[PDB]
Amino acid sequence: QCVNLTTRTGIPPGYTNSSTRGVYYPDKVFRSSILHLTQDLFLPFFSNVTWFNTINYQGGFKKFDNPVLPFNDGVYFASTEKSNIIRGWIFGTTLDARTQSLLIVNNATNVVIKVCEFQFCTDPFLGVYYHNNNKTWVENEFRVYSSANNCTFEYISQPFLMDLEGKQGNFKNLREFVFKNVDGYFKIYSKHTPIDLVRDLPRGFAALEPLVDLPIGINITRFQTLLALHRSYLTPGNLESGWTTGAAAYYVGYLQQRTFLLSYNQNGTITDAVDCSLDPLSETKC
Amino acid sequence: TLKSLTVEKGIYQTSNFRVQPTISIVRFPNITNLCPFGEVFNASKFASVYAWNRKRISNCVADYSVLYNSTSFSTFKCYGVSPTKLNDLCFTNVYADSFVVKGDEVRQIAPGQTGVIADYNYKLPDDFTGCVIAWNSVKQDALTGGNYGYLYRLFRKSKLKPFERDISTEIYQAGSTPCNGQVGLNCYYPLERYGFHPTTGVNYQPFRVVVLSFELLNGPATVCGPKLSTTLVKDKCVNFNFNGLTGTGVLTTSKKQFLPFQQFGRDISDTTDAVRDPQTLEILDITPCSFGGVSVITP
Amino acid sequence: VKGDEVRQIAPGQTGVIADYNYKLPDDFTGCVIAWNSVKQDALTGGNYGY
Amino acid sequence: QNAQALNTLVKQLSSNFGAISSVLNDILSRLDPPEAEVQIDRLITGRLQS
Ligand SMILES: *[C@@H]1O[C@H](CO)[C@@H](O[C@@H]2O[C@H](CO)[C@@H](O)[C@H](O)[C@H]2NC(C)=O)[C@H](O)[C@H]1NC(C)=O
Ligand SMILES: *[C@@H]1O[C@H](CO)[C@@H](O[C@@H]2O[C@H](CO)[C@@H](O)[C@H](O)[C@H]2NC(C)=O)[C@H](O)[C@H]1NC(C)=O
Ligand SMILES: *[C@@H]1O[C@H](CO)[C@@H](O[C@@H]2O[C@H](CO)[C@@H](O)[C@H](O)[C@H]2NC(C)=O)[C@H](O)[C@H]1NC(C)=O
Ligand SMILES: *[C@@H]1O[C@H](CO)[C@@H](O[C@@H]2O[C@H](CO)[C@@H](O)[C@H](O)[C@H]2NC(C)=O)[C@H](O)[C@H]1NC(C)=O
Ligand SMILES: *[C@@H]1O[C@H](CO)[C@@H](O[C@@H]2O[C@H](CO)[C@@H](O)[C@H](O)[C@H]2NC(C)=O)[C@H](O)[C@H]1NC(C)=O
Ligand SMILES: *[C@@H]1O[C@H](CO)[C@@H](O[C@@H]2O[C@H](CO)[C@@H](O)[C@H](O)[C@H]2NC(C)=O)[C@H](O)[C@H]1NC(C)=O
Ligand SMILES: CCCCC/C=C\C/C=C/CCCCCCCC(=O)O
Ligand SMILES: CCCCC/C=C\C/C=C\CCCCCCCC(=O)O
Numbered sequence: 083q084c085v086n087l088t089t090r091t092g093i094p095p096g097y098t099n100s101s102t103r104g105v106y107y108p109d110k111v112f113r114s115s116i117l118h119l120t121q122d123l124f125l126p127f128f129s130n131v132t133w134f135n136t137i138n139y140q141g142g143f144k145k146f147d148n149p150v151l152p153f154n155d156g157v158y159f160a161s162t163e164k165s166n167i168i169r170g171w172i173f174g175t176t177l178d179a180r181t182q183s184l185l186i187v188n189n190a191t192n193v194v195i196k197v198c199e200f201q202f203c204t205d206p207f208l209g210v211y212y213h214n215n216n217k218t219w220v221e222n223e224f225r226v227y228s229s230a231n232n233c234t235f236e237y238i239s240q241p242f243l244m245d246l247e248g249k250q251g252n253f254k255n256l257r258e259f260v261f262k263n264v265d266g267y268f269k270i271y272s273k274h275t276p277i278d279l280v281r282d283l284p285r286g287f288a289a290l291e292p293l294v295d296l297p298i299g300i301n302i303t304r305f306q307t308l309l310a311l312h313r314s315y316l317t318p319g320n321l322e323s324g325w326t327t328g329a330a331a332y333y334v335g336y337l338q339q340r341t342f343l344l345s346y347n348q349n350g351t352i353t354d355a356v357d358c359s360l361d362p363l364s365e366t367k368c
Numbered sequence: 369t370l371k372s373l374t375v376e377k378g379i380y381q382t383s384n385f386r387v388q389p390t391i392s393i394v395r396f397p398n399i400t401n402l403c404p405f406g407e408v409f410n411a412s413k414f415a416s417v418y419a420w421n422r423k424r425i426s427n428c429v430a431d432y433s434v435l436y437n438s439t440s441f442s443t444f445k446c447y448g449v450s451p452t453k454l455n456d457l458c459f460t461n462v463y464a465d466s467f468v469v470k471g472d473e474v475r476q477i478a479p480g481q482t483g484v485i486a487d488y489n490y491k492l493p494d495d496f497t498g499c500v501i502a503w504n505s506v507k508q509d510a511l512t513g514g515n516y517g518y519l520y521r522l523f524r525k526s527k528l529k530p531f532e533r534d535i536s537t538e539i540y541q542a543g544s545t546p547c548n549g550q551v552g553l554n555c556y557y558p559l560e561r562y563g564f565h566p567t568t569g570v571n572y573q574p575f576r577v578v579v580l581s582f583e584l585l586n587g588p589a590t591v592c593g594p595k596l597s598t599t600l601v602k603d604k605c606v607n608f609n610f611n612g613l614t615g616t617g618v619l620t621t622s623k624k625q626f627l628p629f630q631q632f633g634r635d636i637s638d639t640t641d642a643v644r645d646p647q648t649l650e651i652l653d654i655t656p657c658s659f660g661g662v663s664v665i666t667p
Numbered sequence: 668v669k670g671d672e673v674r675q676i677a678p679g680q681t682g683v684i685a686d687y688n689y690k691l692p693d694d695f696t697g698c699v700i701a702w703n704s705v706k707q708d709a710l711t712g713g714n715y716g717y
Numbered sequence: 718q719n720a721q722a723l724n725t726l727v728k729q730l731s732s733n734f735g736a737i738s739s740v741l742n743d744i745l746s747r748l749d750p751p752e753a754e755v756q757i758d759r760l761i762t763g764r765l766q767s
């Protein structure tokens with residue numbers, strides 16, 4: 083079904099840091115005007131972060147930046163995009179159908195979560211077609227895996243509609259996700275904040291509300307990021323069919339067990355956090 | 369207070385010795401449909417232990433009285449909560465796990481237990497809240513020829529993590545020689561078929577086990593015990609039962625608003641300062657009925 | 668009682684026997700003794716007296 | 718110093734002295750009285766010590 087992608091200028095990714103990103107609500111309990119000390123897997127302040135960005139500008143140096151990343155006791159994912167290039171993630175130990183794997187993907191309208199022994203191919207991507215006659219986009223070429231199997235867990239949301247282009251320059255989405263696998267439960271925390279930064283991860287504090295706790299009950303050691311490419315009138319052939327991606331950036335960080343002091347607002351929203359291990363001043367504050 | 373018949377002249381601050389609450393109120397959400405006990409327990413077929421089946425239960429009334437005539441349970445154990453209090457409590461996240469094991473492997477289905485089922489088939493978290501239910505299923509799970517449909521994983525590289533299911537059929541090589549499939553001298557197929565028979569001993573007889581895992585007070589609860597709701601009483605000291613939380617306090621409207629994920633609020637002391645009414649999404653502040661402060665000045 | 672209802676005869680236990688037949692105080696001091704009585708309490712036709 | 722001492726005492730209530738919960742109501746709601754007494758006693762001894 084799916085095929086490998088050729089003609090990609092392969093350059094290793096950039097490195098960034100998370101100034102205060104990756105803080106999430108520990109529990110659904112409501113607390114107001116109080117400072118609470120909690121120990122949980124957390125993203126350490128100013129932790130090393132890997133920056134994978136898709137620039138397909140004319141003149142060469144085009145890249146897709148789609149590698150396999152290890153899942154180390156949970157991961158922090160931040161995506162800055164205006165074209166919705168990021169579509170989802172695949173989580174599995176081997177990803178070759180020998181073991182069950184988790185697929186989370188938004189084809190175009192509704193997010194679909196499936197746990198099945200999937201035969202994921204080397205290049206798991208999604209496809210879009212730009213018609214010049216009637217300026218429209220059908221989002222075709224859905225090719226993440228080659229085969230399914232048992233499918234122990236199925237989750238499908240109701241259908242919606244989405245913009246498949248929206249290229250105006252600076253990224254405006256800044257979607258942030260935290261993934262944790264504990265006691266056979268996959269926990270996702272999601273925060274969306276509008277941003278105007280042209281090409282860099284913003285330095286800010288965000289609190290990620292709990293989204294879902296899927297009972298996948300599977301072992302996860304590795305993950306990949308699914309991406310969408312658009313092919314129109316350039317160099318057709320299905321391996322290098324002018325699959326230019328206008329612009330997208332994604333950042334990967336690793337959760338570590340840490341002790342954090344969380345400040346609760348009068349309205350009960352976390353507004354500030356302190357990482358005790360980060361520096362001596364933070365250690366005294368804790 | 370002085371523990372003496374005679375009292376001298378003094379301010380004598382005194383401890384309260386009077387009764388205040390006489391009204392008890394129960395607030396539970398509106399649930400009409402009964403829990404699907406018949407699907408969960410009375411099922412034509414049950415999953416194999418290695419591929420244990422997990423079913424989400426929500427929007428149900430948990431009345432276990434209905435099962436009393438229909439089913440008899442050999443083993444009933446609740447770790448998180450006392451069995452008598454189940455009727456008065458609401459369960460936020462109840463999941464039912466169904467599988468078939470040998471009669472003497474029922475003991476293995478407990479937190480901290482070890483054995484073939486615990487190590488490579490089904491694992492329970494040490495901090496487990498919920499009830500484990502087991503009953504003999506020889507009539508439905510045993511055939512005169514023999515039932516070999518049920519399977520268990522005899523060999524695995526490592527012990528399973530809690531609530532982890534593996535259905536891999538990859539050949540296991542005990543010996544150093546790579547197996548490359550082709551089961552041989554030191555290579556063995558991991559799954560082993562059970563051999564249930566009608567005339568077989570009770571230890572070898574098939575047992576159906578259902579494990580219920582749930583959290584009670586924390587989180588919104590769509591599953592509740594069979595207690596009728598009563599009209600809300602406010603501005604009076606009353607005993608209250610909101611979603612299985614029982615306390616004595618004065619109920620008042622609360623300015624503070626919880627976020628949609630949040631269901632209840634706790635103060636610095638960790639007592640439940642604010643609660644949300646189950647039927648109507650109105651935040652109610654909880655205030656201690658007594659304010660204290662009494663002294664008896666006596667000659 | 669039935670063989671698997673023997674567990675119900677304990678303080679704090681719940682079930683048909685505990686709820687509507689025999690109830691033990693939570694602060695119970697004493698010993699509970701149970702033994703199989705199939706030879707004396709069972710008949711080929713069946714014993715429905717209990 | 719006097720205000721701080723009263724404030725710390727209110728904070729001590731949050732701590733659980735080996736009990737499943739630091740809230741008396743939660744223990745009473747989830748546990749029958751014989752099991753509940755052991756947990757309540759742990760909270761009572763710690764609160765008396767504070
Ligand atoms: C894309 O290229 C990769 C090579 O990296 C191919 O992966 C190979 O898959 C075959 C199975 O037929 C194995 O024999 C090789 O060991 C694999 N190579 C590596 C290094 O992983 C993959 O098949 C190609 N995809 C397609 C559809 O052509
Ligand atoms: C962490 O990343 C931030 C953002 O990339 C870095 O801040 C940049 O620092 C360079 C060099 O001083 C400036 O030219 C940029 O303007 C800064 N950007 C922003 C948005 O602040 C920072 O140097 C990195 N290092 C740490 C650990 O703070
Ligand atoms: C989760 O999956 C990983 C595989 O990514 C398992 O790690 C292997 O463990 C075995 C021994 O059990 C080692 O010999 C291998 O070197 C490990 N790595 C790989 C790549 O196979 C891990 O054991 C699994 N965890 C559980 C509890 O099954
Ligand atoms: C014209 O507009 C429509 C809807 O966006 C599309 O027309 C489809 O063209 C495909 C072939 O590419 C046909 O198989 C469909 O039957 C057409 N559908 C309709 C409703 O006519 C197309 O995206 C646009 N561009 C073209 C090819 O004219
Ligand atoms: C998951 O899927 C696999 C693939 O079918 C099942 O394994 C068996 O595969 C062979 C073919 O190689 C079939 O002949 C068997 O019928 C399959 N088993 C059964 C029960 O039919 C495997 O059984 C499935 N696992 C689960 C838990 O359903
Ligand atoms: C409770 O269950 C018992 C099971 O023995 C029921 O009694 C039997 O009912 C069946 C039909 O369902 C009859 O064929 C048997 O003759 C009955 N046996 C006896 C000893 O009466 C009983 O009907 C059930 N009662 C209720 C209210 O459900
Ligand atoms: C005869 C050799 C004994 C050697 C003693 C030294 C330690 C080994 C024994 C301790 C573990 C108990 C083994 C019993 C296994 C029970 C199997 C089960 O319950 O699933
Ligand atoms: C299948 C529905 C399960 C949904 C979970 C929500 C509450 C229901 C489970 C808690 C009650 C315990 C049931 C065990 C009955 C014991 C029978 C007995 O020996 O007396």
Ligand SMILES: *[C@@H]1O[C@H](CO)[C@@H](O)[C@H](O)[C@H]1NC(C)=O
Pocket residue numbers: 097098130131
């Ligand atoms: C982050 O990781 C890279 C590669 O390991 C390393 O070179 C760098 O020193 C680390 N920290 C910084 C400063 O980005």
Ligand SMILES: *[C@@H]1O[C@H](CO)[C@@H](O)[C@H](O)[C@H]1NC(C)=O
Pocket residue numbers: 189190191192194241
């Ligand atoms: C997306 O969801 C599923 C993914 O399997 C797909 O079958 C379906 O056709 C898609 N729906 C829409 C409206 O895009």
Ligand SMILES: *[C@@H]1O[C@H](CO)[C@@H](O)[C@H](O)[C@H]1NC(C)=O
Pocket residue numbers: 347348349
């Ligand atoms: C809290 O809520 C109030 C009322 O909605 C709002 O005006 C205020 O901006 C919010 N934020 C603060 C200051 O906590």
Ligand SMILES: *[C@@H]1O[C@H](CO)[C@@H](O)[C@H](O)[C@H]1NC(C)=O
Pocket residue numbers: 410438
């Ligand atoms: C159980 O299921 C069988 C088959 O569907 C049905 O006949 C019976 O009435 C059900 N109820 C009992 C007795 O548990």
Ligand SMILES: *[C@@H]1O[C@H](CO)[C@@H](O)[C@H](O)[C@H]1NC(C)=O
Pocket residue numbers: 397398646647648
């Ligand atoms: C439950 O019913 C009451 C009375 O009809 C109503 O006021 C309340 O809003 C209902 N709540 C739900 C859960 O719909």
